[PDB]
Amino acid sequence: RVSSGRDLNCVPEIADTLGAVAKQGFDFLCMPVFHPRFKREFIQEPAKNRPGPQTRSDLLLSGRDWNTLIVGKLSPWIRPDSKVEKIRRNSEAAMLQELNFGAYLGLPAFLLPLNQEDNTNLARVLTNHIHTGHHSSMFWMRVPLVAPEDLRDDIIENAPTTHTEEYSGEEKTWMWWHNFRTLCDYSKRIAVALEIGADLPSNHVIDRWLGEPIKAAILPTSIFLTNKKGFPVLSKMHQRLIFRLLKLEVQFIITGTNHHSEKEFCSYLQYLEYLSQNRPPPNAYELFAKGYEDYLQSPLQPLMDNL
Amino acid sequence: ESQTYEVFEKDPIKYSQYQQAIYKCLLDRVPEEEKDTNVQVLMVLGAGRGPLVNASLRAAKQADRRIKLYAVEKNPNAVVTLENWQFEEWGSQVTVVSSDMREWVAPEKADIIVSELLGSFADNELSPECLDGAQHFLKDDGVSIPGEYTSFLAPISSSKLYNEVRACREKDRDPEAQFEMPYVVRLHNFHQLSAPQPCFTFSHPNRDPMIDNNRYCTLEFPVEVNTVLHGFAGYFETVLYQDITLSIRPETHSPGMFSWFPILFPIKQPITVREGQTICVRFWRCSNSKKVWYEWAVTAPVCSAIHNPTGRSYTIGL
Amino acid sequence: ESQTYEVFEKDPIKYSQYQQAIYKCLLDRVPEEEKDTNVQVLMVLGAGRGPLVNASLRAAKQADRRIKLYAVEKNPNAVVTLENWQFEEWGSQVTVVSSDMREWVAPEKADIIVSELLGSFADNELSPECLDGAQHFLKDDGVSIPGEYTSFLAPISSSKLYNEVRACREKDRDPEAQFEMPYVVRLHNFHQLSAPQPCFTFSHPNRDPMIDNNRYCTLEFPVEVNTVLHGFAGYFETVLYQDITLSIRPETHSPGMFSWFPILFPIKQPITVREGQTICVRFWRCSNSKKVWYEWAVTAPVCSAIHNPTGRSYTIGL
Amino acid sequence: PNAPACMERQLEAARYRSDGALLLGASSLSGRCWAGSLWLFKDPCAAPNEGFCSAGVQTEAGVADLTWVGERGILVASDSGAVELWELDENETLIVSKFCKYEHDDIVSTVSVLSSGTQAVSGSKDICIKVWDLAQQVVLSSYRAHAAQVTCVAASPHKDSVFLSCSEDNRILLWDTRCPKPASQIGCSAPGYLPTSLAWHPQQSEVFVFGDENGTVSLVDTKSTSCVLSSAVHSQCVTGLVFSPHSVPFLASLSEDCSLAVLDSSLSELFRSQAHRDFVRDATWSPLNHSLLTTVGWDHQVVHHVVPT
């Protein structure tokens, strides 16, 4: 079947964007709930007294569409762990304003990015939001397999990429996730949205994500190769990981622009659906155990109790 | 949430009643000679997503009178709905105010203040406190819609509901906390043991020097059957304007109005009642700096413990 | 209670320091030429049973200056002690005010505001909020005594205290609530793992447009020994006036001053620390409409959970 | 006037061409529709009135940045991830789309035209820097040197293979397309506050100014004594830095604190304007009267300042 979603940071008109995305075959849309560039001031005059609606109306979609088709995204300027106090304070207020608006809309999930080592204040703001009312909506933490600092081109002459194998260092993004969830005291509402890079890390790095609550896998269009016919495809190494992720039954997210411009955008999803269709079948045990995955039970006592 | 406002808006009976009450009040404030010469300052206090703003506009057009609207809303999320409605449809006629009605510094005084801050037990959403704060910016001769509300109580027998309440015991809290708090519930499998009697009444505006929203009420319920008392069902009635009312009291229930289900005040221990005996209950509306709450006790045929003392199990945040 | 005030008054070092600070400030506001020609408005905010009122009078007599005293006290019980002292000894020179310093409408503006609203972790009795409210009735050139305070923290090892905290598990509440709250304790059987570092600082008067008493502080504690982290000991330091200070920080501890014991911020799970490793802790001072609270977490060598999120286990009532 | 009926509230860019005509960029950063527009005002005093423009066009997404390309070209950094080229018609009454190439995987945040005027450099939130061939309508080079969002790209005034870039990864990079490893990290003495704006000196070939997230403006010489000279100009982040057309140039600095500052050669303040009620987004000096300076803000104000030279 495979559950799929489209990631965008540009939604000029919400109605047609959703419509166009649905027409491509996608089950949901990851989009900003406030304009990603619309930086807001909460303390200083005259900018704090900016008028007009702060974002688009909830009336633009049906309650069911908000609840089932939209995954919210935190604004890229919201930096709760900034070393600048003024930025930190506006970002706390903005994070709450955005997370509260998502709650108002009844959004099923909301995306937050783990793009650096220190996300302590981001963790604090999110734990205070979790402990303010109900416990429905999911929080998808956007964390890459390989840190952006470790996948940059070796094009800076006076700052070369480290050619020393750092076993623990290649696993830095897991510790960013681990620290955050440890701080938020293992909240069941906090999961992983794992971002796949152009070059897959060493197997050990991939294996670290075993046992972790992966609810989404983010596939950029830029990681796709081009086959003879000019269609987007993946390396055999990338395919292997997709098959492992399909055993976890994750939701797949396609991010980025069309890099195969001569073809329709849906070709990226068509490929994904093909890998989903061409996966090994469930054996007698895998068929029987279906529905019992990580379901805890009391061990049976046929001596003390009559079965 | 947006979905909670969407379900309030699904009740047409409520807003058609509000529109009618505003229309009737407009004709009593502006006579046909002053028709389009005098403009009435109307303030919707707790405007939500704006259905009351639209009701006030439909009323001014049907009455053929001039109105200047203010839409006061504390919820910033609902303010986004309001500010988008304002810009797209309402225009300069409607001024959207993102403020708590108690904190708001008004530019003008109001002729009419329109609000829907009522719970299933009328005052349990703290309509009195909210409207008392906002009272200062109403003109001396000013009208509040609603003008009055009254809560009602009746003793009930229901072993199913007693079992349901019991099942609300939670870890990390008093093992009997569940009995010291009201529940909004569509009462089905129950028995009313006596007729509903008025409990607490509030009137707006509150023209008295020492304004006190605290109350103590004693209710005597004649019982003509042998039975077991499991709690008290709560309802309300309100006067929007003159004969324009809204009621959830079963005997006078507004037809087709599903905006409020009844409330249930449980009792920790079931009380046996014999035919000819009177059930006597005492209810208190209490408050401090930061919270408001109810306390209750049964004194006849036997005593119960005072339920929710100091709001230890249930409070309404100010 | 009366006995709590009686034990505060048993510390002479504290009031002799306050008297000295008032005396020194009086000489800096009134020069010898204006000696008995200019009368200084002095307001004791949170006057208690009046020892600060007597300290202000002893200071004005020793400085040979003229003062008009106001004794502001919210506690009505303490007001009885005050009003009896006023009538019997103080006279018209002292005006007893039964009010919250934040709510009080002052007849005159103050030259000096004297207060003792400090806890073991300085600001934990909400001295900042209280003095911010009262700030409006202080003259532009006005002095606040104390002018400044700073809280301090240091990591501690103590298996006895960890066991003591654990033993505070109570029925009807989160089974780990006891670890998410500070304790005033005369620390005996413990080990300080690193030197105290300043945590939060407040200054009075608060001359800034957007006044924010919220804080976030990161502290890095170099550890030169192998050990187990069980919590954090908290102390404070204050500047009453110029070089006149009061301190519970061990290295600078005011001699013979027993008015404050240290505070202890526990951690739910003990953290192993190796020699040469740094302990990194984060503390937050938070607040809403009605409450103020602390939140804390250890991020190095390993992470802890954020302790007391949203003040779920411990709050300070506004 | 053959253009959109209404121009979006959030003005992002203001740029004067040789003759004195004003180019404007706007986005709707709120409400139902999040789109943008491009406007030409031969009478800059009539701006932002839509009925008094020379030309006007609606773009599909928002305008994060724009730049003039000669005298009739308009290069646009779009929210869509596209770099757009627009061209004024023969009469200069219509703004027509030449190309719209969607090459970036996120919002195109910054754009600068190289010395030749036949090549352009784009920066994005997608962390890439792209070198474009404007005539061939293609990407010549794609560089992933940064580790975070690319805030600013500033092409060298006379060296066509040289440009500056700054990012949220705290790097200020000096580029020279001639080298095999084209980027070089210019060390701002230690870590510090993130760089938010860049401006090449119009006379001194190896000199540039840069603004940070904390409101400090710093003056850098590519080949000097390691450390520079600075001034705490703003209370909030320095959004932009623009040099005057004068022989001895003055520097205009604009911030999120809603103020404009005009500084001298040694970074000392000469002018300050608090005319804007919201964020100051762009600044452009009149080519005709060098004592004039136009600023645009999110408050929808086109303010013409009389700078005391």
Ligand SMILES: Nc1ncnc2c1ncn2[C@@H]1O[C@H](C[C@@H](N)CC[C@H](N)C(=O)O)[C@@H](O)[C@H]1O
């Ligand atoms: N003190 C207050 N200040 C401002 N708005 C308030 C206050 N108390 C409650 N409200 C708002 O009043 C509304 C009450 C609603 N249940 C009714 C909304 C609307 N009248 C409707 O029928 O849909 C909510 O939107 C509250 O946020």
Ligand SMILES: Nc1ncnc2c1ncn2[C@@H]1O[C@H](C[C@@H](N)CC[C@H](N)C(=O)O)[C@@H](O)[C@H]1O
């Ligand atoms: N906002 C407030 N308004 C008035 N008094 C206050 C306020 N907050 C605290 N207080 C009083 O301040 C006093 C603080 C005492 N610990 C000190 C009393 C006295 N200074 C002494 O050293 O004995 C108490 O009597 C409190 O009731």
